[PDB]
């Protein structure tokens, strides 16, 4: 790996610099290098990994949607299809890279609920991103569902209802149901029960944790407004 010669601590430091500079491709490459040092990641480092790749794939998803819309309108030369395929293939490459890091060997070494749920959620997320462009589609959807479901089972057993990782997992699984799996009723049910159960646990939290939890609860609410 091109980052194999750099110290782990230097890679983490440079990932934080890249974030400040909004250089998310660099940030992802630094965090990939840190993962490949073989040590488990701290909570802070897991978040840096997620921030980096979510911004990279986020730009690719936005571009893919633009090009796909143009392509569908053109079907109401090969260039539009070719360029959409180019972006699609790069997007799939990033998703495969993240999934590879999770499988080699972040998930298998993650024993604590906070890390294991975080990584399984990520696995569901990047299979969901693959599903968005798939037309293998059924198997990709099943892989996302399976990862989300294992994460959900652990989170309900091991985390309080207001835990931001648990909340963000439930949010994304509900989006999976609504956008990917053609299950809007499952999506609404999951979002509502998650919101209500979190509401009832807010009283246990400090001011800072309260802010973290309610931020994600507002996203659940906004989706329920959009879906109903």
């Amino acid at each position: 790996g091109a980052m194999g010669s750099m110290e782990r601590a230097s890679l983490i430091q440079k990932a934080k610099l890249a974030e400040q500079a909004e250089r998310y491709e660099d940030m992802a490459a630094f965090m990939k290098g840190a993962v490949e040092k073989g040590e488990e990641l701290s909570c802070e480092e897991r978040n840096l990994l997620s921030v980096a790749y979510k911004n990279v794939v986020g730009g690719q998803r936005a571009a893919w949607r633009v090009l796909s819309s143009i392509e569908q309108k053109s079907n109401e030369g090969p260039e539009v299809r070719e360029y959409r395929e180019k972006v699609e293939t790069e997007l799939q490459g990033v998703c495969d890279t993240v999934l590879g890091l999770l499988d080699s060997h972040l998930i298998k070494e993650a024993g604590d609920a906070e890390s294991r749920v975080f990584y399984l959620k990520m696995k569901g997320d990047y299979y969901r991103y693959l599903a968005e462009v798939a037309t293998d589609k059924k198997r990709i959807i099943d892989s996302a569902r399976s990862a989300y479901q294992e994460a959900m089972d652990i989170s309900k057993k091991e985390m309080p209802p207001t835990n931001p990782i648990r909340l963000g997992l439930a949010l994304n699984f509900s989006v999976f149901h609504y956008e990917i799996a053609n299950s809007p009723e499952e999506a609404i049910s999951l979002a509502k029960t998650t919101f209500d159960e979190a509401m009832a646990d807010l009283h246990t939290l400090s001011e800072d944790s309260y802010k973290d939890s309610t931020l994600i609860m507002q996203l659940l609410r906004d989706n329920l407004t959009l879906w109903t």
Partner: peptide, 8 residues
């Protein structure tokens, strides 16, 4: 639909 922020 809104999905989760990356940092949690």
């Amino acid at each position: 639909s809104h999905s989760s922020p990356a940092s949690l």
